Amino acid sequence: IRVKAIILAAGLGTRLRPLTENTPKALVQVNQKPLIEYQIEFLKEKGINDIIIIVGYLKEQFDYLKEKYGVRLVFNDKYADYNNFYSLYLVKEELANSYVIDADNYLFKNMFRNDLTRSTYFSVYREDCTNEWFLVYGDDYKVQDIIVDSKAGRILSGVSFWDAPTAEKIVSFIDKAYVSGEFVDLYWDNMVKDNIKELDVYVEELEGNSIYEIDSVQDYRKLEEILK
Amino acid sequence: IRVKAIILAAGLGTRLRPLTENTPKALVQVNQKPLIEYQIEFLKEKGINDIIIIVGYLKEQFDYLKEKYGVRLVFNDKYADYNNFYSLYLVKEELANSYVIDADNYLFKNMFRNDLTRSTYFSVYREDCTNEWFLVYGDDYKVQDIIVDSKAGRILSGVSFWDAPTAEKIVSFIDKAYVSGEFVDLYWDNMVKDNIKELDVYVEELEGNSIYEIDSVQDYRKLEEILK
Amino acid sequence: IRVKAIILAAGLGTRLRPLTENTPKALVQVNQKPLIEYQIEFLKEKGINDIIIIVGYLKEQFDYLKEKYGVRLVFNDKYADYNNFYSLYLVKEELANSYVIDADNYLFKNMFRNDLTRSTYFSVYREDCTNEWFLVYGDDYKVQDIIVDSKAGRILSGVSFWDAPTAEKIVSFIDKAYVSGEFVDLYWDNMVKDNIKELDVYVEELEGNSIYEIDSVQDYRKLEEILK
Amino acid sequence: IRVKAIILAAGLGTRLRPLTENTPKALVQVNQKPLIEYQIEFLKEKGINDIIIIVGYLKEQFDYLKEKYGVRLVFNDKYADYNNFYSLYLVKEELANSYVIDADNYLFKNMFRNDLTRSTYFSVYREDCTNEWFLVYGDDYKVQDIIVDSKAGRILSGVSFWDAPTAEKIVSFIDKAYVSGEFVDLYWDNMVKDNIKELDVYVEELEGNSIYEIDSVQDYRKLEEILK
Ligand SMILES: C[N+](C)(C)CCOP(=O)([O-])OP(=O)(O)OC[C@H]1O[C@@H](n2ccc(N)nc2=O)[C@H](O)[C@@H]1O
Ligand SMILES: C[N+](C)(C)CCOP(=O)([O-])OP(=O)(O)OC[C@H]1O[C@@H](n2ccc(N)nc2=O)[C@H](O)[C@@H]1O
Ligand SMILES: C[N+](C)(C)CCOP(=O)([O-])OP(=O)(O)OC[C@H]1O[C@@H](n2ccc(N)nc2=O)[C@H](O)[C@@H]1O
Ligand SMILES: C[N+](C)(C)CCOP(=O)([O-])OP(=O)(O)OC[C@H]1O[C@@H](n2ccc(N)nc2=O)[C@H](O)[C@@H]1O
Ligand SMILES: [Mg+2]
Ligand SMILES: [Mg+2]
Ligand SMILES: [Mg+2]
Ligand SMILES: [Mg+2]
């Protein structure tokens, strides 16, 4: 009944070079501070101190967080071999009642809560139009579908929460998926998207400047100015 | 009698995620330069300016090529429906005396030529042992067979040329194929390999670091260093 | 106190060629039925028999409507010289308590009513992202702003109603505009968008398949399938 | 110095439904014979064998002509996106000393000649009065002007021949036009009509039953009887 946080931070983050040439993405800094720190401090300040960080590319640079925040680091040796599906596979049983977080995000405000009662997707609305995973939901905010597409709307923004019963249904797809031998290129998120029919997930529309994703030096350049 | 180039680049490139989530594999860059640019600039330098690029997945990202190199982009709306047999089908009439290229390859050296006089496959030798399409030829370099298999040897490496008489035989197979009703999974190469007996094709043994394919983030990791 | 309709239909419809070289867009047919007929029959069925159609390009092809529906056609001789600002100027006095309709739109449902009491824009939400005129409004549905831009949102969809007091303020802008000497490229809609601050306009969100615009032969192709 | 022909046959011919539902316009048949066959055979019998057919809508139904008459087919992928300006753009290099033909015309007689020495328009006289493009020429038959209008006179009838120098002047407009960004709606003929001042084109008055156009099920119904 205690809420923990899983942070996916193993990737190479090649789209951000030269910035990530000798620095993992998660530890890239804005307003003179590492990206992963903002989320760790927001998670702790909200009483979520059970924090597991999946590492890989340049993992030695994370070691100091154990001492500083008391985070549990976990090594994915296949961080360049597979996609983050495997990273989550590694801690596939800690999913229940835990937050899953894409480390490459800048959080403007702390939207975390240990009172969460159901599987949630913390969705921001992209007025523009880029290729993302889009959430298809009604007035009950229950997620009807997830669709990859290029357009505008509410997307999977890199922060979610999975309750025990749903997590259980998910882990069962992870096993089959893994044993299938076909998951290399799969995002852990494919488990939900391709099985959304069997799961009950809800959206939590965020607003204003909240979760800014940095997938390229240009974004880093934008968020830079937004912070002006 | 003018040599033209057809570049296949409409695929999802899923085996390259996350690198290819918001960037076509064809446009992924090595040494701050899109893959497709090395090939186009190589083609041009050798006098081949009649370039037709088939696009689909994230097509909008190719638009700047038109203005920059004077290329022609063609949209395959079934790019996620069918294998690249359909991509070639769309331009099946521009085959004769044209090069056909797999855009997801890195070329170390410009092995192109507008003087080519016969159907050629620029094959590389794979000393290791992976599963590919192996070229079976004698001392005349005339292709005797093409066999899918896991081993070492000379392989279809993503670059070839087709003369008018050969293209004609091919395009006739493409038609029956199309009208057959079944061609979803066929690579356009299934046209040759499955009728190699009726065609006259020659091999052009490449050597050293010539054509480097990136079908996975590891290869992309490798190639990086090779260029160290 | 009687509701009348004003249908703009004088345009060249060049973006629909060849479909429109010998037929006005307003008369192009979907399901063996001219576009303008769907609107007129909907307007009539809800008691709006006071219909005024401005025509120009290929005007002679509208003449049968007079006999068939009892509509009044008004000839805009500058239909190729000026944008529809002038088309409405012609009938700027019949504005009060009347619908203003862009003829080049298909209507899936009859959203016309003779009980309207305030100025309304019947809007559709565009999930994709094209360049249009966007409606900026609150929870009162009172229009706060109208912006030209390319994105998603609620857009002016070619159907609106204007009440006496609002029509009065608008007609006063038309006059000044006309006598200003510059109005060649102005949509009649410019009168509202550029004085939205002095006017009280409300939105009436439309849902589902309601108002489909055919501004190109592709759309005409789409709408085709939609009705599959 | 060899004369070739370019037949434009990519459009959708919607105005001809139901006749063109599962048949391209060029392959709608009169006297159990496809329209494009009459023009191909007249063109051959006069020694013009260098025939390039531009296809699109239902293109597969043309493949047989390659074997049968040895015509070269060409695929315009934007056949429903743009007007035939683009279709001609694809082969803008084969214009010089070549006939340009609108495949939706029934030829009563073979007015083709490989001896042509100057840009020509094989004009017919319409005693009636429809909206078409009219040739304004003097007694020297040199075209002074082309004007869209609704009346009687000599029109652009769907057959013409262009010489090297004129075609050279026309191709330079085609280029600026394309790079302009706006041609989406231009007929290839717009190049001639909106530049007629810079070109030397002549008229070749046809007489009696020569070229009958089928743009609608009404025309087809007429021609039917004329042949009675
Ligand atoms: C498509 N989605 C919405 C499901 C997720 C989008 O993911 P993406 O395309 O931005 O790629 P990304 O690598 O930046 O994914 C974000 C998170 O996955 C992590 N990651 C990636 C690959 C890998 N083997 N292990 C990981 O832990 C990254 O470090 C990063 O923190
Ligand atoms: C099996 N062979 C030897 C014939 C070739 C190997 O082909 P492959 O297995 O690497 O799969 P692949 O999808 O990468 O094929 C390479 C090229 O096909 C293109 N491609 C693929 C599918 C599709 N519908 N259209 C395409 O244009 C890709 O963009 C890529 O440039
Ligand atoms: C820009 N908006 C949002 C104000 C409206 C969009 O208008 P549009 O860009 O689609 O151009 P359009 O020509 O289709 O305008 C729609 C209506 O105006 C009519 N029209 C246009 C010009 C003119 N001189 N007289 C007219 O009556 C057309 O016939 C058509 O029924
Ligand atoms: C206005 N003119 C005089 C310039 C030509 C008249 O042209 P039209 O109004 O009869 O329309 P149309 O679609 O029949 O044009 C005739 C020829 O263009 C071809 N066509 C049309 C659209 C397109 N993208 N490519 C084409 O090649 C048609 O197949 C047809 O054979
Ligand atoms: Mg990311
Ligand atoms: Mg490949
Ligand atoms: Mg319109
Ligand atoms: Mg015609």
CB of A102 closer than 6 angstroms to any ligand 1 atom = yes
Closest ligand to the CA of C156: 3
Measured from CB, residues less than 6 Å from any atom of ligand 3 are C 8-11, 54, 76, 79, 82-84, 86-87, 102-104, 133, 156, 187, 189, 215
A96 touches chain C (CB under 8 A): no
- The pairing of strands A211-213 and A120-121 is unpaired
The C-alpha atoms of residue B213 and residue B96 are separated, in whole angstroms, by 25
Q: What angle do CA C27, C29, C35 make, to 5 degrees?
A: 55
Residue A173: both structure tokens together? 């797809």
Residue B128: both structure tokens together? 């290791």
Q: Which of A115, A200, A112 is nearest to A158 (CA)?
A: A112
Tally of structural domains, chain D: 1
Distances (CA, A) of B221 to A13, B19, B79, D189: 12, 11, 27, 53
The C-alpha atoms of residue A227 and residue C200 are separated, in whole angstroms, by 37
Q: Which of C203, C199, C135, C137 is nearest to C171 (CA)?
A: C199
Q: How many CB atoms lie under 10 A from the CB of residue B170?
A: 23
CB of D59 closer than 6 angstroms to any ligand 4 atom = no
**Helix H or strand E encompassing D222:** helix D217-226
Using an 8 Å Cβ cutoff, are B16 and A83 in contact? no
Q: D74 to chain B, minimum CA–CA distance in Å?
A: 7
Type of residue at C168: E
Q: Which atom of ligand 2 is nearest to the CA of B189?
A: 4
CB of A135 closer than 6 angstroms to any ligand 1 atom = no
Residue C176: both structure tokens together? 């000044």
- In chain C, % helix, strand, coil (3-state, to 5) comes to 30, 30, 40
A60 touches chain C (CB under 8 A): no
HSE-CB of D28 using CA atoms within 13 angstroms: 29
Select the residue of A83, A131, A150 nearest B18 (Cβ to Cβ): A83
- The pairing of strands B211-213 and A159-162 is unpaired
Tell me the three-class secondary structure of chain A, residue by residue. CCCEEEEECCCCCHHHCCCCCCCCCCCCECCCCEHHHHHHHHHHHCCCCEEEEEECCCHHHCCHHHHHHCCEEEECCCCCCCCCHHHHHCCCCCCCCEEEEECCEEECCCCCCCCCCCCEECCEEEEEEEEEEEEEECCCCEEEEEEEEEEEEEECCCEEEECHHHHHHHHHHHHHHHHHCCCCCCCCCHHHHCCHHHCCCEECCCCCCCEEECCCHHHHHHHHHHCC
Rg of chain D over Cα atoms, rounded to whole angstroms, equals: 17
Residue A160: both structure tokens together? 């979610």
Select the residue of A14, A81, A131 nearest B58 (Cβ to Cβ): A131
Type of residue at C104: D
Q: Which of B84, B76, B72 is nearest to B56 (CA)?
A: B76
Residue C201 Cα to chain centre, angstroms: 16
Using an 8 Å Cβ cutoff, are A177 and A85 in contact? yes
To test the pocket of ligand 3, the residue of C187, C201, C219 to mutate (highest count of ligand atoms within 8 Å of its CB) is: C187
For the beta sheet containing C159-162, the strands, ordered from the edge strand earlier in sequence to the opposite edge, are C72-75, C50-55, C4-8, C98-102, C159-162, C120-121, C202-203
Chain B residues lying within 8 Å of A84, measured CB to CB: 18
Question: Cis before residue C18, ω within 30 degrees of 0?
Answer: yes
The C-alpha atoms of residue A189 and residue A87 are separated, in whole angstroms, by 11
Contact B90 D77 (CB under 8 A): yes
Q: A103-136: buried (b, 16+ CB within 10 Å) or exposed (e) per residue?
A: bbbbbeeebbebebeebbbbbbebeebebbbbbe
Q: What are phi and psi of C191, to 5 degrees?
A: -65, -35
Type of residue at D37: E
Residue B181: both structure tokens together? 């009703």
C152 touches chain A (CB under 8 A): yes
The C-alpha atoms of residue A71 and residue A65 are separated, in whole angstroms, by 6
Resolution (A): 2.4
HSE-CB of D40 using CA atoms within 13 angstroms: 24
Chain A residues lying within 8 Å of B19, measured CB to CB: 14-15
| Cα C210 to averaged position of ligand 3 atoms, centre (Å) | 19
Taking phi first (over 0 means left), then psi (-120 to 50 degrees means alpha), and beta for anything else, what does residue B207 get?
beta
The C-alpha atoms of residue C217 and residue D57 are separated, in whole angstroms, by 13
Q: What torsion do the CA atoms of B91, B96, B102, B107 make, to the nearest 10 degrees?
A: -140
| Cα B214 to averaged position of ligand 6 atoms, centre (Å) | 7
C125 touches chain A (CB under 8 A): no
**Helix H or strand E encompassing C180:** helix C164-180
CB of D189 closer than 6 angstroms to any ligand 4 atom = yes
Chain C residues lying within 8 Å of D56, measured CB to CB: none
Q: How many CB atoms lie under 10 A from the CB of residue D115?
A: 7
Tell me the three-class secondary structure of A163-216, residue by residue. CHHHHHHHHHHHHHHHHHCCCCCCCCCHHHHCCHHHCCCEECCCCCCCEEECCC
Distances (CA, A) of B165 to B101, D60, D213: 19, 21, 38
| Cα D173 to averaged position of ligand 3 atoms, centre (Å) | 29
Instruction: Supply the CATH number for residue D33's domain.
Output: 3.90.550.10
Contact D131 C21 (CB under 8 A): yes
Neighbouring subunits of C (3+ Cβ pairs under 8 A): A, D
Residue A146: both structure tokens together? 């997830």
CB of D146 closer than 6 angstroms to any ligand 4 atom = no
The C-alpha atoms of residue C8 and residue B220 are separated, in whole angstroms, by 58
The C-alpha atoms of residue C23 and residue C18 are separated, in whole angstroms, by 9
To test the pocket of ligand 1, the residue of A36, A102, A148 to mutate (highest count of ligand atoms within 8 Å of its CB) is: A102
Type of residue at D224: E
Closest ligand to the CA of A212: 5
- For tokens 């009887």, the residue is D225
Chain C residues lying within 8 Å of A152, measured CB to CB: 127-129, 151-152
The C-alpha atoms of residue A2 and residue B75 are separated, in whole angstroms, by 52
- The pairing of strands B211-213 and B124-137 is unpaired
Measured from CB, residues less than 6 Å from any atom of ligand 2 are B 8-11, 54, 76, 79, 82-84, 87, 102-104, 132-133, 156, 187, 189, 215
- For tokens 């093409």, the residue is B146
**Helix H or strand E encompassing C36:** helix C35-45
Q: D156-169: buried (b, 16+ CB within 10 Å) or exposed (e) per residue?
A: bbbbbbbbeebbeb
Q: Is B220 helix (H, G, I), strand (E, B) or coil?
A: helix
Nearest residue (by CA) to ligand 3, atom 10, is C215
To test the pocket of ligand 4, the residue of C12, C15, C19, C21 to mutate (highest count of ligand atoms within 8 Å of its CB) is: C21
B69 touches chain D (CB under 8 A): no
C153 touches chain A (CB under 8 A): yes
Q: D51-90: buried (b, 16+ CB within 10 Å) or exposed (e) per residue?
A: bbbbbbbbbeebbebbeebebbbbbbbbbbebbbbbbbbb
| Cα C128 to averaged position of ligand 5 atoms, centre (Å) | 22
Cβ contacts of A221 within 8 Å, gap of 6 or more:
none
Q: Among all residues of chain B, which has the CA nearest to that of D73?
A: B93
What's the distance, Cα to Cα, between the start and end of chain A in Å?
A: 41
The DSSP 8-state label assigned to residue B11 in this structure reads S
The C-alpha atoms of residue D3 and residue C203 are separated, in whole angstroms, by 62
- For tokens 């100025």, the residue is C119
| Cα A100 to averaged position of ligand 4 atoms, centre (Å) | 57
HSE-CB of D182 using CA atoms within 13 angstroms: 3
D60 touches chain B (CB under 8 A): yes
Q: Among all residues of chain C, which has the CA nearest to that of A150?
A: C128
Residue B175: both structure tokens together? 């038609």
Contact B17 A80 (CB under 8 A): no
C21 touches chain D (CB under 8 A): yes
Chains A and D touch (3+ CB pairs under 8 A): no
Instruction: Provide the residue range defining the domain that includes B198.
Output: 1-228
Q: What are phi and psi of D88, to 5 degrees?
A: -75, -30
| Cα C70 to averaged position of ligand 4 atoms, centre (Å) | 36
